[PDB]
Amino acid sequence: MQILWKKYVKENFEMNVDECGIEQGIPGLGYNYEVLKNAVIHYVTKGYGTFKFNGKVYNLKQGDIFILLKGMQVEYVASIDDPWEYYWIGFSGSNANEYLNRTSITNSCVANCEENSKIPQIILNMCEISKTYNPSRSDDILLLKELYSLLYALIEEFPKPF
Amino acid sequence: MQILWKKYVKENFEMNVDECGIEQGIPGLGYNYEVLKNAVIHYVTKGYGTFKFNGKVYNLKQGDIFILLKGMQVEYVASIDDPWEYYWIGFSGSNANEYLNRTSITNSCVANCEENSKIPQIILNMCEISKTYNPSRSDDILLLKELYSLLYALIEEFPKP
Ligand SMILES: OC[C@H]1O[C@@H](O[C@H]2[C@H](O)[C@@H](O)[C@H](O)O[C@@H]2CO)[C@H](O)[C@@H](O)[C@H]1O
Ligand SMILES: OC[C@H]1O[C@@H](O[C@H]2[C@H](O)[C@@H](O)[C@H](O)O[C@@H]2CO)[C@H](O)[C@@H](O)[C@H]1O
């Protein structure tokens, strides 16, 4: 029921691309679970949905981001009228977790990408690569390069105060 | 002596930027040693020098690359007439060593960059960052991003079959 759901092996422990996904929601349907994966950033490419976390209910649309971190009790559901499509990057590693603690997003776990954000292009590009993933053509190197670019862009656009 | 020689800590074991350097050579002077560092790619930005490895003697110039790998007995010397300047990136890690085994450059340890090579810009950019390295502005993330771009560019331009 996903356009794309590429799951990668966990062979790197400093920086690792765990999975890349694309899902068109069905109206009024979503997911309600305790997050098991290390970290999963979602980018809303179309339509509307809601993200519920820690007593707060966010009405998200095209351009918005939400991030799932291990242990979060979450619910995210497509709108009954105009159901969202989202792209996601799951990632892990000691370096990945250190870089996430340098961004302001890991508190509220929701954000909006600005006009000239570099984040949408990186997430879309990582999902594009994932559709024809070929490690013998060194797609593994390119995905890690993009993951470093993505975490740099998150810190650049959503900095924690120094 | 070196206008730049930034040495970094070895804290990453999958991919690590070990050092970045810029050296204008002195005529007829060079180095003659067994390489201790994991991997060190040099890009010749001007003049001429020679790289001697395993009985072969290479006359290099602007645009050329040579790579030092741990254990290589090497000699590299600036030309008397027109001494080279080179930029270098030292790097290590299991991923780094796997990706190096995917490029044809680790056979001869020498290459020439094509007209529109992406390699010069990356090495120059990593040395530029190294001059004002500020980890609290996440320069550490940017240098590893550039190292992944560099190894990708080496494989793209100098592939094994
Ligand atoms: O991981 C992003 C992905 O999450 C799916 O939800 C899964 C989750 O991945 C898995 O760890 C958990 O055990 O089950 C969840 C399904 O209830 C979403 O289905 C998918 O749309 C993405 O959001
Ligand atoms: O590492 C590139 C750098 O090497 C210098 O030579 C050093 C080398 O780094 C060190 O490991 C070894 O013990 O001694 C060498 C000096 O003899 C070069 O001086 C420098 O120009 C770069 O090529």
mmCIF file with all atom_site columns, C-alpha atoms in Angstrom, chain B residues 8 16-21 37 39-41 88-92 126 147:
data_model
loop_
_atom_site.group_PDB
_atom_site.id
_atom_site.type_symbol
_atom_site.label_atom_id
_atom_site.label_alt_id
_atom_site.label_comp_id
_atom_site.label_asym_id
_atom_site.label_entity_id
_atom_site.label_seq_id
_atom_site.pdbx_PDB_ins_code
_atom_site.Cartn_x
_atom_site.Cartn_y
_atom_site.Cartn_z
_atom_site.occupancy
_atom_site.B_iso_or_equiv
_atom_site.pdbx_formal_charge
_atom_site.auth_seq_id
_atom_site.auth_comp_id
_atom_site.auth_asym_id
_atom_site.auth_atom_id
_atom_site.pdbx_PDB_model_num
ATOM 1  C CA . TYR B 1 8   ? 41.868 16.121 12.984 1.00 0.00 ? 8   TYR B CA 1
ATOM 2  C CA . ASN B 1 16  ? 37.033 9.988  8.992  1.00 0.00 ? 16  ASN B CA 1
ATOM 3  C CA . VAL B 1 17  ? 38.755 13.152 7.693  1.00 0.00 ? 17  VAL B CA 1
ATOM 4  C CA . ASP B 1 18  ? 42.295 12.702 9.215  1.00 0.00 ? 18  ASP B CA 1
ATOM 5  C CA . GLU B 1 19  ? 43.958 15.908 7.812  1.00 0.00 ? 19  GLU B CA 1
ATOM 6  C CA . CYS B 1 20  ? 43.883 18.596 5.056  1.00 0.00 ? 20  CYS B CA 1
ATOM 7  C CA . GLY B 1 21  ? 47.033 20.352 3.747  1.00 0.00 ? 21  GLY B CA 1
ATOM 8  C CA . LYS B 1 37  ? 48.533 7.223  7.381  1.00 0.00 ? 37  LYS B CA 1
ATOM 9  C CA . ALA B 1 39  ? 45.119 7.155  2.706  1.00 0.00 ? 39  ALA B CA 1
ATOM 10 C CA . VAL B 1 40  ? 46.243 10.619 1.493  1.00 0.00 ? 40  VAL B CA 1
ATOM 11 C CA . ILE B 1 41  ? 45.110 11.994 -1.885 1.00 0.00 ? 41  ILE B CA 1
ATOM 12 C CA . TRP B 1 88  ? 45.931 16.911 0.202  1.00 0.00 ? 88  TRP B CA 1
ATOM 13 C CA . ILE B 1 89  ? 43.124 15.099 2.093  1.00 0.00 ? 89  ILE B CA 1
ATOM 14 C CA . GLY B 1 90  ? 44.069 12.317 4.554  1.00 0.00 ? 90  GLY B CA 1
ATOM 15 C CA . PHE B 1 91  ? 41.156 9.968  5.388  1.00 0.00 ? 91  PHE B CA 1
ATOM 16 C CA . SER B 1 92  ? 40.424 6.552  6.981  1.00 0.00 ? 92  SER B CA 1
ATOM 17 C CA . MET B 1 126 ? 37.766 20.686 2.036  1.00 0.00 ? 126 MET B CA 1
ATOM 18 C CA . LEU B 1 147 ? 34.631 13.133 1.766  1.00 0.00 ? 147 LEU B CA 1
#
